[PDB]
């Protein structure tokens, strides 16, 4: 099992961590949804598919900076929505290609009150997830860092 | 179709204050944003703020915090700019422009895509 | 505050021909758009996120560029291109212009 992103940064097998610059809306309204969308950026594969079979789950979510002091929201995994930053650990998604797949997670936050001004920074870190991985066939359990940072600013009006 | 139409040219004393307006027709007015952008010397543009329709908040640019206010009324889809106290230096044609951003757009589309055509400001005695 | 730069402030290019307008920025940003003004006209959009034709721009219009440094290309002159061309971001607040550049038409 290894995972990269877009840009062709990989982890290998056994964990590690990698960072992720991701696109944002110019302007989020009070009472609209700021999308993080990060299935098209984190793929993950299975390099034995024809014996092993591999769960993958989200055991954290966390915030920072701007999105901690800002926003609040939840995130989308696999068929249902959680609280952001996550109380608990998803349910599991399971790996058995040798292809590439996304990881389907997605994060919707939402302005606070008292939120203006420019909300996020460019280049500033908004939140670590953490992926782990167990499989069918042994004991392994590894876990996969991802650092998420904005790559422009964003407002609201006020 | 979608038009947006400011007033005419305008001349104003030194220290005066002026209000332009910006109406809009064709689309939806609650469903996009409002910018004003100000050309001086024909050649030089600028930025002045982002409006919300729905609430009524602002992104100004702090060049002009204390010149400028931006305000907006529903009832007649109509935006509003105010400049405070009028001298040599505010004579240029300010737009107002509709702006697709302000929600997440799926084709990544976040622009003024559609302009009023300028309303002319000198500033004489 | 990020400043955009274009040079020269005014280029020329006979009819037919290829040429390419450049925008360069203090600080890096991640995308360039351009916007069209022709004389006694309000400007108008032609490209968005440094790549992307508007609605109904005809396809000769192109973008390139990455970090401190955009182009926007023009691969064959009509005599209706005869404009003023400015860059803009909205990378980093506030949002700014570019300087200009006048395009004229050798006949």
């Known amino acids: 099992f290894a995972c990269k992103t877009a840009n062709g940064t990989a982890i290998p097998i056994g964990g590690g961590s990698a960072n992720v610059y991701v696109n944002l809306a110019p302007v989020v309204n009070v009472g609209q949804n700021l999308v993080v969308d990060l299935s098209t950026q984190i793929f993950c594969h299975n390099d034995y598919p024809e014996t092993i079979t591999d769960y993958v789950t989200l055991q954290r979510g966390s915030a920072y900076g701007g999105v901690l002091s800002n926003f609040s929201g939840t995130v989308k995994y696999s068929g249902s929505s959680y609280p952001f930053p996550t109380t608990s650990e998803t349910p599991r998604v399971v790996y058995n290609s040798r292809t590439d797949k996304p990881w389907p997670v997605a994060l919707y936050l939402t302005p606070v009150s008292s939120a203006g001004g420019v909300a996020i920074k460019a280049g500033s870190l908004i939140a670590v997830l953490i992926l782990r991985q167990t499989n069918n066939y042994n004991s392994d359990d590894f876990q996969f860092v991802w650092n998420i940072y904005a790559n422009n600013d964003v407002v609201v009006p006020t | 179709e979608v038009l947006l139409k400011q007033s005419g040219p305008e001349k104003v004393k030194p220290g005066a204050s002026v209000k332009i307006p910006c109406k809009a027709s064709?689309?939806?007015?609650?469903?996009?944003?409002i910018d004003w952008v100000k050309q001086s010397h024909g050649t030089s543009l600028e930025w002045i703020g982002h409006?919300?329709?729905?609430?009524?908040?602002?992104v100004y640019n702090q060049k002009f915090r204390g010149k400028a206010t931006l305000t907006v009324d529903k009832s007649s889809s109509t935006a509003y700019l105010e400049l405070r106290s009028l001298t040599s230096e505010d004579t240029a044609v300010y737009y107002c422009?509709?702006?697709?951003?302000?929600?997440?757009?799926?084709?990544?589309?976040?622009?003024?895509?559609?302009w009023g055509q300028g309303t002319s400001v000198t500033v004489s005695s | 505050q990020i400043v955009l730069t274009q040079s020269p402030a005014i280029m020329s290019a006979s009819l037919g021909e290829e040429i390419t307008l450049t925008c360069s920025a203090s600080s890096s940003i991640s995308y360039m758009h351009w916007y069209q003004q022709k004389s006694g006209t309000s400007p108008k959009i032609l490209i968005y996120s440094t790549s992307n034709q508007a609605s109904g721009v005809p396809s000769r219009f192109s973008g390139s560029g990455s970090g401190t440094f955009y182009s926007l290309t023009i691969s064959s002159v009509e005599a209706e291109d005869a404009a003023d061309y400015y860059c803009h971001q909205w990378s980093s607040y506030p949002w700014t212009f570019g300087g200009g550049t006048k395009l004229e038409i050798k006949r």
């Open positions: 064709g689309y939806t007015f609650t469903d996009y944003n």
């Open positions: 422009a509709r702006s697709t951003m302000g929600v997440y757009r799926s084709d990544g589309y976040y622009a003024m895509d559609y």
């Open positions: 409006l919300d329709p729905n609430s009524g908040g602002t």
